Each structure stands twice: as structure tokens, then as C-alpha cells.
Amino acid sequence: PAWTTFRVGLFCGIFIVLNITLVLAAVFKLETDRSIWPLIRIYRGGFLLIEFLFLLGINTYGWRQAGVNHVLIFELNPRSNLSHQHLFEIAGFLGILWCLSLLACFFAPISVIPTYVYPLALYGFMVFFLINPTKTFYYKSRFWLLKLLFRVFTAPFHKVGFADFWLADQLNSLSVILMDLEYMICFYSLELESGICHKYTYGVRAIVQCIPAWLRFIQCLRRYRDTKRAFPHLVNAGKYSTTFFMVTFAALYSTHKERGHSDTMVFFYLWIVFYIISSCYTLIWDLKMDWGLFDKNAGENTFLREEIVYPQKAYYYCAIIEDVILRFAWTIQISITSTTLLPHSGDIIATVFAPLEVFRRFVWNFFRLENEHLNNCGEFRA
Amino acid sequence: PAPAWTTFRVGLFCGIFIVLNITLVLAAVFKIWPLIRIYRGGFLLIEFLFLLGINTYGWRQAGVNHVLIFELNPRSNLSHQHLFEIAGFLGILWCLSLLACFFAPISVIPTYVYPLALYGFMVFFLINPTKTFYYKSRFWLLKLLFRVFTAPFHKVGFADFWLADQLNSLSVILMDLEYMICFYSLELESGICHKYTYGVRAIVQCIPAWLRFIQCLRRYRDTKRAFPHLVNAGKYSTTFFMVTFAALYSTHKERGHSDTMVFFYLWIVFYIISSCYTLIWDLKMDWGLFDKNAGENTFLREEIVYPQKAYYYCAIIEDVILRFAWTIQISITSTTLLPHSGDIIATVFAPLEVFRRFVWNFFRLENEHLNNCGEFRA
Numbered sequence A: 001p002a003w004t005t006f007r008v009g010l011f012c013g014i015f016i017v018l019n020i021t022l023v024l025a026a027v028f029k030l031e032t033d034r035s036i037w038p039l040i041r042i043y044r045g046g047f048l049l050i051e052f053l054f055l056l057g058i059n060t061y062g063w064r065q066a067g068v069n070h071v072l073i074f075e076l077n078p079r080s081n082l083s084h085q086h087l088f089e090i091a092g093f094l095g096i097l098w099c100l101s102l103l104a105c106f107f108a109p110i111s112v113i114p115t116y117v118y119p120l121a122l123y124g125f126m127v128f129f130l131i132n133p134t135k136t137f138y139y140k141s142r143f144w145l146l147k148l149l150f151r152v153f154t155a156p157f158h159k160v161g162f163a164d165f166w167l168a169d170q171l172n173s174l175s176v177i178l179m180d181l182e183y184m185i186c187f188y189s190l191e192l193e194s195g196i197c198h199k200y201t202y203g204v205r206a207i208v209q210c211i212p213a214w215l216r217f218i219q220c221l222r223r224y225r226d227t228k229r230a231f232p233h234l235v236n237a238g239k240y241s242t243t244f245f246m247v248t249f250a251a252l253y254s255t256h257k258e259r260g261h262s263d264t265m266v267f268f269y270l271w272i273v274f275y276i277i278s279s280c281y282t283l284i285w286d287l288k289m290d291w292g293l294f295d296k297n298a299g300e301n302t303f304l305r306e307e308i309v310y311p312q313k314a315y316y317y318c319a320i321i322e323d324v325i326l327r328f329a330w331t332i333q334i335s336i337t338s339t340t341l342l343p344h345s346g347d348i349i350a351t352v353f354a355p356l357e358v359f360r361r362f363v364w365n366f367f368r369l370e371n372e373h374l375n376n377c378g379e380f381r382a
Numbered sequence B: 001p002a003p004a005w006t007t008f009r010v011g012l013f014c015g016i017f018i019v020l021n022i023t024l025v026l027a028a029v030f031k032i033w034p035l036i037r038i039y040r041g042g043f044l045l046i047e048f049l050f051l052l053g054i055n056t057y058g059w060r061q062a063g064v065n066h067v068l069i070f071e072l073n074p075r076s077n078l079s080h081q082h083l084f085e086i087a088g089f090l091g092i093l094w095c096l097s098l099l100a101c102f103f104a105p106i107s108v109i110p111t112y113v114y115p116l117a118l119y120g121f122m123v124f125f126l127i128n129p130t131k132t133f134y135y136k137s138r139f140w141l142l143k144l145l146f147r148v149f150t151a152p153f154h155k156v157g158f159a160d161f162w163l164a165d166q167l168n169s170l171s172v173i174l175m176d177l178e179y180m181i182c183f184y185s186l187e188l189e190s191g192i193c194h195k196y197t198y199g200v201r202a203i204v205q206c207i208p209a210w211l212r213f214i215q216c217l218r219r220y221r222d223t224k225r226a227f228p229h230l231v232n233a234g235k236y237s238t239t240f241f242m243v244t245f246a247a248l249y250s251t252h253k254e255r256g257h258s259d260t261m262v263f264f265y266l267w268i269v270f271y272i273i274s275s276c277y278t279l280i281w282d283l284k285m286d287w288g289l290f291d292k293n294a295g296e297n298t299f300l301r302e303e304i305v306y307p308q309k310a311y312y313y314c315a316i317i318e319d320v321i322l323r324f325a326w327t328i329q330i331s332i333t334s335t336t337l338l339p340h341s342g343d344i345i346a347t348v349f350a351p352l353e354v355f356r357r358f359v360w361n362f363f364r365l366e367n368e369h370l371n372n373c374g375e376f377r378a
């Protein structure tokens, strides 16, 4: 309805402005305040999670409006569905909790409750919300999500469907959340040197960064084993292995910068070349293999596929441009997040880029679901 | 029905505008050029656009065929949703400019560039050559403005008279523009323009009423109907007398001619005369109320299209109050009667005058639909 469209637009505008203001305040705090780095890192995971949930609600609304059969693609129950308004409500409720926790931590209203326990309690309450035997909240969707997450984490044990690969890609985008969680664990273990967690890179950080790409690589290998087709799966596996190569080269470069062994330059060059390789690989896969654009058969649409479900091709063109820019940004953000690299500007770069990466993956979800509905690019469906 | 994309844009713009207003309030409480004077014109324009969208929605709901009265094309019409969208976008730009002024994010860019750029967009929006951003309606508005400004040369239609009345209620924007010109010329004695008033200020204040007076004279010449057009001419000359007498009184206050009291009394009497004239003409004729025919309705015209008569009573009371309010507002704005608090009173009253003119638009269009009050139709 028209009123529903107005409500969705109002929510989108309010959320966009609030997110932009929060990011601007975060960057302003950085390089001007000290000891705000751990707080920003702690709250960035929740901020990104809320942003991803709201943008997924927007994706569901757009798929419903354009006629994209995302329900069939995800193989969800036609009778019972989670409307875009439900996702918006979930995102707003989580955002309200996050804002309240941040405000309480900053104000320190009560000395009895320590300031540092507020984010921990918020993240524990969020986990309990995710895993709740009671039917207090939506139980069908939550149980489906829990089962899908368990399947995704067990990439080689279970066969790969569209939903599993899609959530693996989302986690690949949301790797910043996992990295921030690991950093907060380190901060609680050691801080609670002062910056020892972020001052020096370590293998556990690289493994945490590579985890999402690790699951994606295992899923692609399992798909190759099942279907025995090298082109659609081993190429993607190599695309994801570029992430591991770049992360390990960055870690070696940072370590040899800390300790001079004359191998810093070669590690730097290896990191640069593999970063370019990974950026190009991911960009090419997203633009062509996932979206399906640049199709030769397209005669009416230039640089796009023959069939398009969205009214405007300007959407596709701006999506291509923003995907290029934000893929480069996401690769460099992963580089700085996994390994120390820039000491000061790294945190600001990560804070600026993570919301941009989430938005890029939101657009990617849009176009990938459109292509999947139009053609069985993923081949998951019959 | 309006496009769903238009509704989405309206909602997004409204949300961004609300959040920007909250941020502006927080910055103002938490934190060279008078910003209120510069930004009052833009705020009034945005408020007028929003109220015009409300007016269009109400006209559509009540059955008022405003398109025929305005001689607009039935095939293409600017729905209230488009008016809300443009109002929200302009408000977002205005709030962004004000926030930039408050924060001064960029040092190299002078602060004063922010407002000039803002208004620079708006005029560029109004004169955009490309066929975009409601280009047809924009061109119609440009033609209507040109015809209104050339009051005597062109015959007066309902649209021209309506836009002239709008300018009469929107004289605050012109006054602020003139004040900005004076500030640029002289300031860049402190507050020389604020301290003293001159005849040019009175002429600028009277430009809208001057245009209305010329339009009424042209209508008298064309139709040959002496009564209504000449009464309208007297009603628009009362304001000229008010402003000139106020300016003379202010000058006598500045320079001790010793005849200040006589001019003050003349200003007061002409002010009450102008207020009574405008009130009587608006309620008796423009709205068509107080008709003798109405038997079941008291102080109201026989035929009413709005759901409730309480609307008609509240409109009567608010018009009674706000016509006098707008008279005093002109008095202070055009002359240095209350230099210490004149600006505050003027800026408080300007939104009130805009709201009064919005209700007046509602009821004038209802009356025009019911009867050919303006005589613009055969």
C-alpha cells in the first residue's frame, strides 16, 4: 500500500541519517581521542549487524515489489513468510538496545554497574534472543536461521544450497563483526601492553579474518565434488583462496616490519600483487558470475544482461560503479583489519569502510537474487 | 493515484528532514551574519510549499475542482505528494546548509557561502532549463510569476491574483532579501540597516500590495465594475498608507521634527483601518461566509463543502487574530518601531501569516468552487 511505502521510506531515511551521524561521530572520536578505540571496536560489530538486518529488510521489500521470487530461491515456506516490516522491527529493536547500551556505558549512570559490562550484556542478550526456546519472538524464522547457520559452519558435512552459500557470502561481508568480536575478547583477556591486541598482529587474527572465506572455499569444494564441474566451483575456490594468500602476506609483511630481516620489501610486493589479484577476482565474479551483467546476448541493454526485472538500468550502472569502488575498499579494509598495517589511520579506514561494505553486499544481494530468479546462475535449483 | 516511488521519496525526505531538524535543535542548544534573517525566507518557502500540498489534498478530498479554477491542465496535475516531496527535499537542503553554518566543517570555504549556495540551488531549481524536476509545473510557475510582476500589462486571471496574494503574504522573504542586500553593501556603524529605516524599505514592503493594486485597477478597467475592484483598490491602498505613515513616524523619531505624535496617531488609525478592511473583505467576500441566504448556518454561507462547520468557525477566529497580527508584523518589519524586538516578533509572526494564508487559500478556493466570487469565469 501507499502508506506502507511511506512508512518504509521514512524508516529508511531515519536509519540512513542516524547511521551516517554515528559513523561521523566515530571517525571524529578517532585521531582526536584516546582509549575510544576499544569502545568503537566493541560497538562496531553490533552497529554493522543492525545495519545488515535493516538493509536485508530493504532487500526483502524490494524483491517483493519488483516481483523477484526470493521465497522460491531460498526455498522458504510460501504459507509462512517474514515480511520486510518484521525485519525492520527486528533491526530497530536491536538498534534501540545498542543505543541504550552505548548511552549507559558513556554516561556511567550507576557506579554499581561497571561501564565495560554494558556492551557484553547487550551482546549476551542478543545471543539469548537468537537462541530462545520460548516462543516470545518469531520462532520459525529464528529456528530456520539457526539451522542454516549450523549447516553453513559445517560446510563439507552438508550439501550446499542457495541459502547456505548466500549466508556464507553475508558472513564474508560481515567478517568485520567476527574480527571485532575477537578483538573484544583479546581486550577483555589482556587489557582488562595497553594496545597489545592491536599493536602486533598474530596468527589467530588472520585465521579469524579468513574464516568466512574458509567456509566459502569448503562449500565450493563440496559443490565441485558433488557436480564434478571444475569451472563453476574451483574458480570460486581460488577466488576465495586469494583472500588467504593476501592475509598471510600482509601478516608476514607486518611481522617483518616489526622485526627487520631484509624480507619486508618482498613481502610488501607479494601483498600488493595478491591484493590486486583478489580485488580483480572478486570484482569479476560479482559483476559477471553473480549479477550476470556484461552478457553478450543483451542487445537492448548495454553492459547488462538481456533480461532485467528492475525498471531502470541506471540502477545497474551505479551498482557496477559502487561495487567496483567498494570491492577495492573492502579488500583494503580486510588487509588492515587482519594485520596491523597502518597504525593510526587503520581504525578510521575500517570504521568508514565496514558500513560501506555492508551496503555493497546489500546491493549485491539485490542483484544476485534478481539474477537467480531470472536464471539459475547458482544451479542450486533444478 | 500518485506513483509509489513518489511516496517512497516523500517518506525518505520527511524522515531525513525530521532527523536534520532534531540535529539542528541539538546543535543550537549545545552551541558576523544574522542567520535567522538569511534562513527565514527559505524556511517560509518550505512551509508554504508544505501547506500548499495540504491545500491540494484538502481540495481533492472536498471535491473543490481547483484545477478548473486555476485553469490547469486536467491531463497533467501536480499531486500533493509531489509538493510534499519537493518541500521535504528543500527542507533537507536548508537544514544541511544551516548545520554547515553552525559547525563550519570546512575552513577554506567561507561560512557565508553556505546560505548563498543554498538559495543558489533554489533559484537554479526554479530556472532549470532541462525538462526535469516537474519542468512543466516549473515553467507554469515562472510564467505566472512573470505575469503577476507585469501586473498592468497582462490581464488578471484567478491564478495571477492568487499568486499576487501569496506574494503579499510572503513579503517577509522580500524584506529579508533587501536586508541581506543592505548588510552586504554597508556592513561588509554596526547594524546600520537595522538601526534606521529608509523609503526603499517601504517600497520593497509595498511591492506585493502594489502589484495587487495594479491588478485590481486593470480588472476595473477591463470589467468596468466599479464596486468590487475599487473596494479592493482601497483595501490595498490602506497598507500603502500604513507603511508610509510608519516610515514617516520612524524618521521623525530618528530626527526630532517635533511632529512625531501626529504621525504616530495617523499610523495607528490607518493601521486599524487597514486591518478592518482586510478582515471584512476576506471574511465577507473572499470566503463567501456570513451569507444572508444561509438559514441553518450562522455567520456561514449557505453551501458548505467541508465536513465540519467548526472548521469554518475556527478559521474565522484565527483569521480575525492573524490579519491584525500580519498588520503589526508589516509595521515592525518595514519600519523601526521596535528595533530591539522587531526582528523576533516579525519572525514569530511570519509562520503565523503563512498559516493564515493557507487557511485563506482553503476557504477562498472553496468559495470559488461554490460561486464565481472572483468573476474570472463566464
Ligand SMILES: CCCCC/C=C\C/C=C\CCCCCCCC(=O)O[C@H](COC(=O)CCCCCCCCCCCCCCC)COP(=O)([O-])OCC[N+](C)(C)C
Binding pocket: A049, A056, A060, A074, A076, A077, A080, A081, A082, A090, A123, A126, A127, A129, A130, A140, A141, A142, A144, A145, A167, A170, A174, A177, A178
Ligand atoms: C558474526 C555475528 C553474526 C553475523 C550475522 C549472522 C546472521 C544474520 C544473517 C541473516 C539473517 C537471515 C536473513 C533472512 C534471509 C532469507 C530471506 C528471508 O527473509 O526469509 C525469512 C527467513 O527469516 C529468517 O531467517 C530470520 C531473519 C533474521 C532475524 C534475526 C534473528 C535475531 C538475531 C540476533 C543476533 C544474534 C547474534 C549475536 C550478536 C553478535 C522467511 O521467514 P519465515 O519466518 O518464513 O522463515 C522460514 C521459517 N519456515 C521455513 C519454518 C517457514
Ligand SMILES: CCCCC/C=C\C/C=C\CCCCCCCC(=O)O[C@H](COC(=O)CCCCCCCCCCCCCCC)COP(=O)([O-])OCC[N+](C)(C)C
Binding pocket: B045, B052, B056, B066, B070, B072, B073, B076, B077, B078, B083, B086, B122, B123, B125, B126, B134, B136, B137, B138, B140, B141, B173, B174
Ligand atoms: C521569493 C519568491 C519565492 C518563489 C515564489 C513562491 C512560491 C513558488 C511555489 C509555488 C507557487 C505556485 C503554486 C500554485 C498552486 C496551484 C495549485 C496546484 O497545486 O496546481 C499545480 C501548480 O503547479 C505549480 O505551479 C508548481 C507548484 C510548486 C512546486 C515547486 C516548484 C519550484 C519552486 C522553487 C522555489 C524557489 C524560489 C527561489 C527564490 C526566488 C498544477 O501542477 P501541473 O504540474 O499541472 O502544473 C501546470 C503545468 N501545466 C500548465 C503544463 C499543466
Ligand SMILES: CC(C)CCC[C@@H](C)[C@H]1CC[C@H]2[C@@H]3CC=C4C[C@@H](O)CC[C@]4(C)[C@H]3CC[C@]12C
Binding pocket: B054, B058, B061, B062, B306, B311, B312, B314, B315, B317, B318, B359, B362
Ligand atoms: C489557530 C486556531 C484558533 C484555529 C486553527 C484551526 C486550523 C488548524 C483549521 C482551520 C481550517 C482547518 C482545515 C479545514 C479543512 C480541512 C480539509 C479536511 O479534508 C482535512 C482537514 C482540514 C485541512 C482542516 C485542518 C484544520 C484547519 C487548518
